Design a protein around this nucleic acid. Structure first.
Ligand code: MG
Ligand code: MG
Ligand code: MG
Ligand code: MG
Ligand code: MG
Ligand code: MG
Ligand code: MG
Ligand code: MG
Ligand code: MG
Ligand code: MG
Ligand code: MG
Ligand code: MG
Ligand code: MG
Ligand code: MG
Ligand code: MG
Ligand code: MG
Ligand code: MG
Ligand code: MG
Ligand code: MG
Ligand code: MG
Ligand code: MG
Ligand code: MG
Ligand code: MG
Ligand code: MG
Ligand code: MG
Ligand code: MG
Ligand code: MG
Ligand code: MG
Ligand code: MG
Ligand code: MG
Lengths: 122, 175, 210, 72
RNA sequence: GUUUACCAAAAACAUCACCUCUAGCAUUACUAGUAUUAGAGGCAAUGCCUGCCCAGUGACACCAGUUUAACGGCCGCGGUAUU
RNA sequence: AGAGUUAAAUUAUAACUAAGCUGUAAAAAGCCCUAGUUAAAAUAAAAUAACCCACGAAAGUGACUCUAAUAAUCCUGACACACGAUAGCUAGGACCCAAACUGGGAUUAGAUACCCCACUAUGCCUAGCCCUAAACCCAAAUAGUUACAUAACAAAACUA
């Protein structure tokens, strides 16, 4: 994967939830994303009340879409998902599997520093 | 302005065998469409060294360094046509131009034919450094313009006087 | 004389300007349509610059937006949607379909009445919010207007933005535009003069509550 | 220590600023006259340039623009 | 540039520029226009600027309160440093 | 450098309750279109992490995401070129909160100050200037040494 979409949707039932996911993925495919898979984290009560599209929500479903997308169309994706009203919060990040884990080889113990002051007698 | 195709199949994935038998999905992923700007920069840099360079494996050669710097300057001018108000990148562009000018002078003072080849091919016009860099202010440009115009009028009046004198000489010599 | 200081101007022809943005040719197809912009010209009647727009079998002179150029494509629609629309600079859409932070011009008052407000050069209103199927906009005079959401409006700012910064060189240019000089009578200022600080007048609403 | 020198320079700068504020318009008149003499000396210098080359009148299309008396 | 045609052509008026107020709007003005607009006025391009005051009289607010690029106003008496 | 976003506060504005609220060493002035609780746009600024020492040439930068990106096969070098904290200037916009100036209330022999209240330019964005700082780490850049050696203090003394 290259990009990851943290997609928090409105809490609603199965058929319009699947329909909203359908039009979201066709919106991605219209801008040209090659989507790998879709992930559901379930529906959870939100950490805080989020105001979006003239409404206050407390419960919402968490979904993840990972894809390969050109760098110019991410703004178009964010604009379309901003105008979409069945989503409460879309965000696009670089996927963490792109970077590789550099090695924690251990904590190097730092010496206390020498030679900071002159050898004058106080 | 060279135009890489979207199906360029970027630099790191060209020489591996068995590419054209693989379907359109992986070819689309490995093409320049989902690539970054730096992959396109590598593609342009490789094509430009294959276009102008004599022996491509030598990175340490001055002409190859000028090729890489020219790629970087073209990227910086694209960035400046995008963003006008950046000052750090404008500074980077001017020092990049200055280093390219210095290395072009170094190449010119050592090997003239290769320098002429790069100078013709890249479109760069090498301009010689003018002595006595002074700030041209309004009084100086006004006096210089006046002095040039006075010199033109002096030479024009001298040409008219010489033509009238030659006409008078021919007229009295004919009779 | 009922209005003073008008006369002696240059000869001007009047251009027939179509104010209704959504006007289908025939009633057989009432759907949204798409037209093509040919040229943008100066109009002596108003401060704005106009554009010739052709589609079907007819042309109309419309009020041009800021970056409308020769040979452009402009979409006119009435379709309101719950995914809204992606607003370009040329499109005409109803106010219910536009996003919240939309800059608009040629705002229609009553559904079917036609565009009346925000017509001068460089002036643009801004949509504020959409509640209970009713749109509220902010005018260039910073006054709130309450309108039905199905009224068609054009997204963008009117062309010739630097009309406010246009300098008049002489009184001869005023006489060319047709503004006669003011009277020489010295009138002492009354109580009406002075810097009046007034609170903003309330929202003007054209939605009729039953 | 160095605060004595700093305070002396501070007092000098404060007194100079009060002098500038009290005699602002006299300095404006002096500066305007100095710019006048600057422009006049420039005109005399250019006039000497076209007279010493043999001409009587300045070359055609030369309006000798005011470079010092520009509006603020 | 304009004006007291028939005693006054000007330092008078107008003028670009700069300021105030009053108006969210459709079939005869304004206008077949819509606040970067249109009227009611003041002062005069440009450059430096335009200091203080709502106590009175007006005008908005229909009472409080706000306004001077609104009408307008911006101090006495007495003693003191080598006169 | 652009584009997009807002968690903690705060506020315009509503609904209940109270007659007080703010203000200090102490008081007055101010507000009672006030105060507390519950709902909340816009603007401004980015707790903790940070006992971290990174990026940039310097000024400077530590809320989040994306895009473009951090010269030189790396010596010194201008009056040339390009940047340059805050404060300030022209035009447009925004204005929660802070606040020069100003007006009140305290203090004082006087207070056009230190204390308190309210408000303006301004601090914010876009576009153009201005080119100034205790721009200081008062220690120039690039290669090196711990040999000789303590004016004083401070951040030890020094070669090309
Ligand atoms: Mg007209
Ligand atoms: Mg016009
Ligand atoms: Mg007038
Ligand atoms: Mg008059
Ligand atoms: Mg002195
Ligand atoms: Mg005359
Ligand atoms: Mg007359
Ligand atoms: Mg007469
Ligand atoms: Mg006359
Ligand atoms: Mg006469
Ligand atoms: Mg006059
Ligand atoms: Mg002015
Ligand atoms: Mg004047
Ligand atoms: Mg005054
Ligand atoms: Mg009054
Ligand atoms: Mg009053
Ligand atoms: Mg910016
Ligand atoms: Mg009290
Ligand atoms: Mg607000
Ligand atoms: Mg923070
Ligand atoms: Mg580097
Ligand atoms: Mg150097
Ligand atoms: Mg600066
Ligand atoms: Mg500033
Ligand atoms: Mg303010
Ligand atoms: Mg006081
Ligand atoms: Mg510093
Ligand atoms: Mg120094
Ligand atoms: Mg140096
Ligand atoms: Mg001792």
């Amino acid at each position: 994967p290259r990009y990851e979409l943290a997609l928090i949707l409105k809490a609603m039932q199965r058929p319009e939830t699947a329909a909203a996911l359908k039009r979201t993925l066709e919106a991605l495919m219209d801008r040209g994303a090659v989507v790998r898979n879709l992930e559901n984290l379930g529906e959870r009560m939100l950490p805080y009340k989020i105001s979006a599209h003239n409404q206050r929500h407390s419960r919402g479903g968490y979904f993840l879409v990972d894809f390969y997308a050109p760098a110019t169309t991410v703004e178009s994706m964010m604009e379309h998902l901003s105008r979409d009203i069945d989503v409460i919060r879309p965000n696009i990040v670089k996927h963490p599997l792109t970077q590789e884990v550099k090695e924690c080889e251990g904590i190097v113990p730092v010496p206390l520093e020498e030679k900071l002051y002159s050898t004058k007698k106080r | 302005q060279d135009d890489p195709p979207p199906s360029m199949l970027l630099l790191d994935y060209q020489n591996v065998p068995g590419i054209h038998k693989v379907d359109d999905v992986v070819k689309r992923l490995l093409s320049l469409e989902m690539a970054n700007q730096k992959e396109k920069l590598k593609i342009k840099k490789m094509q430009l060294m294959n276009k102008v360079l004599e022996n491509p494996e030598d990175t340490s050669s001055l002409e190859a360094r000028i090729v890489a710097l020219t790629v970087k300057i073209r990227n910086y001018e694209e960035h400046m046509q995008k963003h006008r108000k950046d000052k750090a990148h404008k500074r980077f562009l001017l020092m990049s131009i200055d280093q390219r000018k210095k290395m072009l002078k170094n190449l010119r003072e050592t090997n003239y034919a290769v320098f002429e080849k790069i100078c013709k091919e890249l479109g760069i016009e090498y301009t010689f450094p003018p002595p006595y860099h002074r700030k041209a202010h309004r009084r100086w440009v006004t006096k210089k313009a006046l002095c040039t115009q006075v010199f033109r009028e002096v030479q024009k009046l001298k040409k008219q006087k010489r033509a009238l004198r030659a006409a008078a000489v021919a007229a009295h010599k004919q009779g | 004389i009922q209005v003073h200081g008008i006369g002696g101007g240059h000869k001007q022809r009047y251009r027939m300007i179509d104010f209704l943005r959504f006007r289908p040719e025939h009633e057989s197809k009432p759907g949204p349509f798409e037209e093509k912009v040919i040229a943008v010209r100066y109009d002596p009647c108003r401060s704005a610059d106009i554009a010739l727009v052709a589609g079907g079998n007819r042309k109309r002179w419309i009020i041009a937006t800021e970056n409308m150029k020769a040979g452009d494509t402009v979409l006119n629609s009435d379709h309101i949607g719950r995914m809204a629309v992606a607003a370009r600079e040329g499109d005409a859409h109803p106010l219910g379909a536009l996003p919240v932070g939309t800059l608009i011009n040629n705002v229609e008052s009553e559904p079917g009445r036609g565009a009346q407000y925000i017509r001068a050069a460089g002036t643009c209103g801004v949509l504020l919010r959409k509640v209970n199927g009713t749109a509220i906009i902010q005018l260039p005079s910073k006054r709130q207007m309450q309108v039905l959401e199905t009224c068609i409006a054009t997204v963008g700012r009117v062309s010739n933005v630097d009309h406010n910064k246009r300098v008049i060189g002489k009184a001869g240019r005023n006489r060319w535009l047709g503004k006669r000089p003011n009277s020489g009578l010295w009138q002492r200022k009354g109580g009406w003069a002075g810097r009046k600080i007034r609170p903003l007048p309330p929202m003007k609403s054209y939605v009729k509550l039953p | 220590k160095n605060i004595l020198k700093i305070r002396r320079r501070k007092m000098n700068h404060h007194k100079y600023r009060k002098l500038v504020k009290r005699t602002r318009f006299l300095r404006r008149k002096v500066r305007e006259g100095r710019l006048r003499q600057k422009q006049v000396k420039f005109e005399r210098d250019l006039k000497r340039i076209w007279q010493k080359a043999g001409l009587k009148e300045a070359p055609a299309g030369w309006q000798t623009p005011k470079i010092y008396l520009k509006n603020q």
